[PDB]
RNA sequence: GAUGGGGAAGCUCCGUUUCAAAGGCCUGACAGGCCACCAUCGAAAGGGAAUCCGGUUAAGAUUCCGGAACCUGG
RNA sequence: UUGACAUUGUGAAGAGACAUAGUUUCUUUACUUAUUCAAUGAAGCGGAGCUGGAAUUCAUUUUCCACGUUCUAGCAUUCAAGGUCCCAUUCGGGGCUGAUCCGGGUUGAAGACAUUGUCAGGUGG
């Protein structure tokens, strides 16, 4: 009744391929596939340069004028799956696959509401866990 | 009729966190996760998290406590504790 | 970097809240820890007699290690080995018709205390081992004297579970060795020559000295400052 | 003892009191239920945890609300404050003083009463002080005492002139009235 | 066996070593509870010749009593302290 | 007035937070971290969440009926 | 109300009796482990160390002191900011310092007397 319901869809993975990453796709599928990712990344680049001009503005102003679904993580971001126009042909031996299925299927896991988004993150301690010497080595005299 | 101690029903009586669920089960995160996926139940989002978690919009998970009631009587858990004793 | 600044607090004596410090020196321990630390402390501070503290003076690392490396060759047969021996010998006596001696002789340590002390005063031992850590010490105090009397090369091992490891019991509090395969006869005979090297002259100084004349650090610093001023 | 607000006690001999001082503040001055003297709700900052720790001192005269108390061992000699008795010279009048250090006061507590340090034994630390009765007594220095007399001296001078006032008096402490 | 080497030793209740151990164990037992349990005796031969057999079901409690007579003072409490325990 | 604990030959007693390992969480990868009490009982006249009217019966109503509001928790 | 037994430990001398040497009679202090008293959410006990300062040095410091707070009815809490080094970028994870190092005696009083268990004098509705 509660175990028998399907999970929530956090940010959408699609199982279907674009059919542009396709071992000599149709060239329009190729073109639109590069174009969408170009839009997506140039947006990130423009906000990057916004941070850059922000930072240099503040660095000027420091000197110029005067003085006297939880865990803080969404699904991990998808990476590029593209072959450029030079590295594609017939003679399938040429084919270099691209895209890490670990990252991608883990995105599917976190996307389809099965698991929470997380680091594997390594060790950590709060306090010193003090060292000192045993009675026996202390008093062997 | 003994005024009813606000935060104890509805959201705060079906939605329970990881931390409280392993206070219940006493066992581990990792056996709690192995059990989760093996007996698969998945985390949820409630409609009002502040009123669920007593004022607090701290980002965390909730697990449909009825499912934990299911997880208690489960044969695999005995076997995991037997793995511990064996080790 | 510029946007963040150095606060630093002044904890001082009164003008702050204090941070969290080590307080293991200061806690309300439970009653059993407050017993079993004070017990060691008391047995340290008190002027023990020398019939005890012929304990408390004992083997070195390598001597103990070669001792146990030897004894870990001659164990008892655990029950697995016994039952295999039985299912062998049942067929062996059913077909071969031996006297239940078709199976060979064992060569193993002999680990009951009463067994040990019975073998002593027949002088059927060549080395016995003794555990320091026994709070019912009356069980054990007579052993080095008795072994001295019967001229058997006693030895006070440190650790009783260490002795249980080679009998397959939790604790044995002794072990002995009376008969050995030939291939460690020299090992044993030389081990005896290490042991008496470690003990035969130490016997003069263990007994003329009443251990545990020790003080704690505050009283020690008190008398040190007194001797310094005087 | 229905209305007794709290025992007229002192702070404890903590690290601040023992290796320094502390600023602590009065909030009000209230009449005790069945006592010849008044008391003082007075508050400090607990230095180990974040909160304002209340304390209940006895109200020496001269002290007003809205007042501070630097107090411990390194406190300046002023009315209302407290010190262990080694730092002061002879003659400093005090009250509510301790028999042993940290007992939070046995002596010189009642209304309009005090005690008078006259001597020191600085080596092998003690301090000589006279009682209100006048019996001399020498006690360790680490124990403490509040400056000044207990407020309300001259409570005794007034007669009562009728029995109902005495009944109202001795209803509060103890049924030791009417006496045979 | 060690039976007699313990028996003939524990008769010597005034030697230095046994009065040392007595000074130790009396303080231990003072700080522990009045009634309590030790999972192994301090006098095993002396147990073993009363009916002890070290197996599953035989138990040892250790116990403490005041000394002195029945105060109502000079009434002398015909119950032995051993029995009282 | 329990329990801890200690006495008492003992029925049961002294004591009520104290010579106690008393209890529960909060994230977060079985490990770290914070908090500090102490039971419980005792007021139909003390504190305290919130309701009025009219009608009605052989007999009751701030209780039912007709109408109209309020409190708490979801 | 006084005395005796044990609880009841370790010490250094003096006077001694004994085999240079251990066994016990007292007089002296001197101590902590027993026990006793009290308090604290059992938080800062004791020692050493830095920094500076008197200190008068009879060489070098013999030493001894201080070692973050005072006109004022406020406020200080989310492992603390900062510095420093790794990490794997990232939203920040970790170490050392900031906040000295070591012991364990929770902190003092008291200590072989107290006291507690048991006995014997004077007094005594």
UniProtKB/Swiss-Prot annotation, chain A:
Function, in words: Late-acting factor in the nuclear maturation of 60S ribosomal subunits, which is required for normal acquisition of export competence. Required for the export of the large subunit. Acts to stimulate the RNase activity of the exosome complex, and may recruit the exosome to 7S pre-rRNA for processing. Associates with numerous RNAs including the 27S and 7S pre-rRNAs and the box H/ACA snoRNA snR37. Also interacts (via N-terminal region) with the mature 25S rRNA and the mature 5.8S rRNA.
Lineage, highest ranks first: Eukaryota, Fungi, Dikarya, Ascomycota, Saccharomycotina
Localization terms from the record: Nucleus, Nucleolus; Nucleus, Nucleoplasm
Parts forming coiled coils: none
Species of the source: Saccharomyces cerevisiae (strain ATCC 204508 / S288c) (Baker's yeast)
Subunit structure of this chain's protein: Interacts with CBF5, FPR3, FPR4, NOP2, PIH1, RRN3, RRP6 and PAP2. Interacts with pre-60S ribosomal particles.
Note: Present with 1600 molecules/cell in log phase SD medium.
Designated gene of the protein: NOP53
Origin: domain of life: Eukaryota
Family the UniProt entry places it in: Belongs to the NOP53 family.
Name of the protein: Ribosome biogenesis protein NOP53
Curated annotation (Swiss-Prot), chain B:
Location of the protein in the cell: Nucleus, Nucleolus; Nucleus, Nucleoplasm
Subunit and partners: Component of the NOP7 complex, composed of ERB1, NOP7 and YTM1. The complex is held together by ERB1, which interacts with NOP7 via its N-terminal domain and with YTM1 via a high-affinity interaction between the seven-bladed beta-propeller domains of the 2 proteins. The NOP7 complex associates with the 66S pre-ribosome.
Cited function: Component of the NOP7 complex, which is required for maturation of the 25S and 5.8S ribosomal RNAs and formation of the 60S ribosome.
Family indicated by similarity: Belongs to the pescadillo family.
Protein's recorded name: Pescadillo homolog
From Swiss-Prot, chain C:
Compartment(s) where it occurs, according to its Swiss-Prot or TrEMBL record: Cytoplasm
GO cellular component: cytosol; cytosolic large ribosomal subunit
Pfam families given in the database record: Ribosomal_L7Ae
Gene3D superfamilies linked: 3.30.1330.30
InterPro entries: eL8/uL1-like, Ribosomal_eL30-like_sf, Ribosomal_eL8-like_CS, Ribosomal_eL8/eL30/eS12/Gad45, Ribosomal_eL8/Nhp2, Ribosomal_eL8_euk
Any one biological process term the GO annotation gives: cytoplasmic translation
Molecular functions per Gene Ontology: RNA binding; structural constituent of ribosome
Broad class of the protein's primary localization: cytoplasm
Keywords: Cytoplasm, Ribonucleoprotein, Ribosomal protein
Function: Component of the ribosome, a large ribonucleoprotein complex responsible for the synthesis of proteins in the cell. The small ribosomal subunit (SSU) binds messenger RNAs (mRNAs) and translates the encoded message by selecting cognate aminoacyl-transfer RNA (tRNA) molecules. The large subunit (LSU) contains the ribosomal catalytic site termed the peptidyl transferase center (PTC), which catalyzes the formation of peptide bonds, thereby polymerizing the amino acids delivered by tRNAs into a polypeptide chain.
Note: Present with 238000 molecules/cell in log phase SD medium. There are 2 genes for eL8 in yeast.
Protein family: Belongs to the eukaryotic ribosomal protein eL8 family.
Name of the protein described by the UniProt record: Large ribosomal subunit protein eL8A
Gene: RPL8A
Swiss-Prot record, chain E:
Disulphide-bridged cysteine pairs: none
Subcellular location: Cytoplasm
Subunit-structure text: Component of the large ribosomal subunit (LSU). Mature yeast ribosomes consist of a small (40S) and a large (60S) subunit. The 40S small subunit contains 1 molecule of ribosomal RNA (18S rRNA) and 33 different proteins (encoded by 57 genes). The large 60S subunit contains 3 rRNA molecules (25S, 5.8S and 5S rRNA) and 46 different proteins (encoded by 81 genes).
Function: Component of the ribosome, a large ribonucleoprotein complex responsible for the synthesis of proteins in the cell. The small ribosomal subunit (SSU) binds messenger RNAs (mRNAs) and translates the encoded message by selecting cognate aminoacyl-transfer RNA (tRNA) molecules. The large subunit (LSU) contains the ribosomal catalytic site termed the peptidyl transferase center (PTC), which catalyzes the formation of peptide bonds, thereby polymerizing the amino acids delivered by tRNAs into a polypeptide chain.
Annotated family: Belongs to the eukaryotic ribosomal protein eL15 family.
Misc. comment: There are 2 genes for eL15 in yeast.
UniProt protein name: Large ribosomal subunit protein eL15A
Gene: RPL15A
